Amino acid sequence: MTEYKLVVVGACGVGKSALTIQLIQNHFVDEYDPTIEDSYRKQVVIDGETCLLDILDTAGQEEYSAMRDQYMRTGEGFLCVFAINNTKSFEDIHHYREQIKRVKDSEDVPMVLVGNKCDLPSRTVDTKQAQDLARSYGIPFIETSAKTRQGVDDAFYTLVREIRLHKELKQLEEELQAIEEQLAQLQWKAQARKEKLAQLKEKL
Amino acid sequence: MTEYKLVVVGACGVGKSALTIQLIQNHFVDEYDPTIEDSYRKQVVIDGETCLLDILDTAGQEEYSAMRDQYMRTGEGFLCVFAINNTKSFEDIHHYREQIKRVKDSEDVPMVLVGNKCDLPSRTVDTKQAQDLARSYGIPFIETSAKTRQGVDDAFYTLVREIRLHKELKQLEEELQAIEEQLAQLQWKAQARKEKLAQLKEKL
Amino acid sequence: VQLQESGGGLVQAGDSLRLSCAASGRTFSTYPMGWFRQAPGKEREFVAASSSRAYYADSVKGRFTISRNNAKNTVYLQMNSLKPEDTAVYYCVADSSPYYRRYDAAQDYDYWGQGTQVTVSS
Amino acid sequence: VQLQESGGGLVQAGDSLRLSCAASGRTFSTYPMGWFRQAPGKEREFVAASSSRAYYADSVKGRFTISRNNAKNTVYLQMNSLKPEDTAVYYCVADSSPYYRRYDAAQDYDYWGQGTQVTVSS
Ligand SMILES: *C[C@H](F)C(=O)N1CCN(c2nc(OC[C@@H]3CCCN3C)nc3c2CCN(c2cccc4cccc(Cl)c24)C3)C[C@@H]1CC#N
Ligand SMILES: *C[C@H](F)C(=O)N1CCN(c2nc(OC[C@@H]3CCCN3C)nc3c2CCN(c2cccc4cccc(Cl)c24)C3)C[C@@H]1CC#N
Ligand SMILES: Nc1nc2c(ncn2[C@@H]2O[C@H](COP(=O)(O)OP(=O)(O)O)[C@@H](O)[C@H]2O)c(=O)[nH]1
Ligand SMILES: Nc1nc2c(ncn2[C@@H]2O[C@H](COP(=O)(O)OP(=O)(O)O)[C@@H](O)[C@H]2O)c(=O)[nH]1
Ligand SMILES: [Mg+2]
Ligand SMILES: [Mg+2]
Questions:
Q1: CA distance to A3, A188, B182, B200, per residue, from B194 (Å)
Q2: Which domain holds residue B29?
Q3: Which of B165, B168, B194 sits opposite A176 (nearest CB)?
Q4: CATH number for the domain that contains residue D80
Q5: Could you say which residues from 51 to 110 on chain D have a Cβ atom under 8 Å away from some Cβ of chain A?
């Protein structure tokens, strides 16, 4: 009754296929084959309400066939991952966002940015730069460490919250439009009837 | 589908039992027994629309039982008759109107005044007085001659017109009230929903 | 309570026609009016309506004209640049309920007329 | 989505009671609320409602109070000068449809509560 679908997009060697497994099975693997592309399902309890999460990790070889994007775009949330040592991954994330914008053709979609593997490795890309990019793009930024299991839950919860906010806004706007049309028609009917009553009373 | 009921009230020797018969059967009688009390039915075509008229002439002996007034008050139109030679009939008409006021308990009822037998007999009561009483009472006044068959049709048509006007006014007022209540409730709902939408938008 | 129609017939393609629907029952100045159409073997489709603002169908937009005169309670439909695919039967409709009724709903109106035939040759 | 009620029980005649009904499902600031009553063997009867203005029934007019608090989505019913004839079961009700719904119609309200018992002794 309450299911949300999320897609995780990143680059090569930036923590791909290492966050979903840690979130689901609570276990870590040092090496995994990137050729594996699989979907995961898990139930959660967020804000006192149970929910279902489907997670799809973008993997596999380079593909551009129309059937791939036809089977895709079913996602409702998008999480883009990056590390603090790949300007190449920065540019890849920018290009991926630019492409999904036009592919979905929706003005705004639930989008979150995640920085992985920060505590252990050396740190190069400035937090000021990361926050500036996040503020310029208009999407939340979250720092997550895969091996220590911190940040994933809050990032997923915030993405779900964004989805809920968008749905509520759409519903409220539609209802307001309907009520406004109601009011206009009733106003015209009342004006006509009152004018007729006045004209009839004037005769007698 | 369109039936109206009228009651004709007068006094002694003021043309009673002589207008209804002339209207219905198109014939005149010089003498009629006042003890006869009967009801008449007739179809008419007024303003291009067919209608049914039931006519009840107030006759018989003086009766004050509650059963009489229970069988009565079913009338929707009232026609009060008078001549130009009986101040007694004038006072009787005034008293009858005063009594039907409280008997019906309605603020206003379809009421017409008719002056009978005017061309032939000597003329005493002033037309200025008659018109002054009619204007003071707020009811139309019509001059009718029984033997020459003039005025009855127009008097009945005007009474029917008053009935139609009253019905139309009541319907229009009821419809306006219902529409206004609709308007109020819908406006409050719209205000609440718009406030909620603004509050939700302010967060994001 | 009664509506009368005039102007139907058979004409050629590309000409212009003008049809009239008059309400002769009683006062209809507080009653919205409109037009519906039906082809042989098809379903009812709303064409135009008179309300607070003019409402039009998607398939005939930009060509038809609807006029209302409250002096005699008449509604006129003027059609120009006519296409041959409009040969059908047209009905005049009116509304009387005080509560809200959908304008594009065929089942929300309560007063109907006899209807007229419009035919266009090749 | 979910409504929880509290405050019922059995008391003596002439005392004063206060019942609470809290909506804990989602936002309800745009949802009108109200109360209905049912005696053993009788039918449903509307008692009070909260709208643009306070509404009351004729049988309990002038001695019941209805209060609303949008801080926590709560509606409170205060009953004084009790009578033994009011021993019954009360339901808390709410409305959600954007279109117009009659306030006194029992079938025009979407969401419903569970029910609380009020008993008056002689
Ligand atoms: C290398 C490692 F295996 C890895 O992380 N991969 C594999 C490749 N894949 C991918 N790669 C590209 O482009 C790769 C570079 C960057 C610039 C151009 N090349 C050279 N592009 C895509 C994908 C996955 C499928 N993507 C796609 C396809 C159709 C529609 C669509 C709509 C919205 C968003 C996307 Cl990403 C869409 C394009 C996956 C992965 C690298 C990432 N993740
Ligand atoms: C005399 C001749 F036969 C005649 O025209 N009549 C007979 C009597 N009748 C009548 N008379 C009176 O009062 C008569 C006089 C006038 C003042 C007081 N007396 C002395 N009152 C009524 C009636 C007929 C029944 N009326 C009546 C009864 C119940 C309700 C009701 C409601 C509205 C209007 C009336 Cl009139 C109501 C009282 C008839 C007739 C003279 C008249 N018409
Ligand atoms: N320093 C550090 N490395 C991590 C952490 N989590 C994963 N890694 C590294 O990420 C590598 C896994 O490669 P992978 O994410 O699967 O690359 P992919 O091909 O894009 O999917 C491993 O070698 C890990 O050493 C972490 O919390 N800290
Ligand atoms: N001069 C004159 N008398 C009329 C006319 N119509 C009726 N009458 C008189 O009015 C009387 C008929 O009404 P009447 O029987 O007395 O009414 P009721 O006894 O009070 O019930 C007759 O005596 C007629 O002479 C008319 O057009 N001219
Ligand atoms: Mg991976
Ligand atoms: Mg007589």
A1: 28, 22, 18, 10
A2: 3-170
A3: B194
A4: 2.60.40.10
A5: 98-100
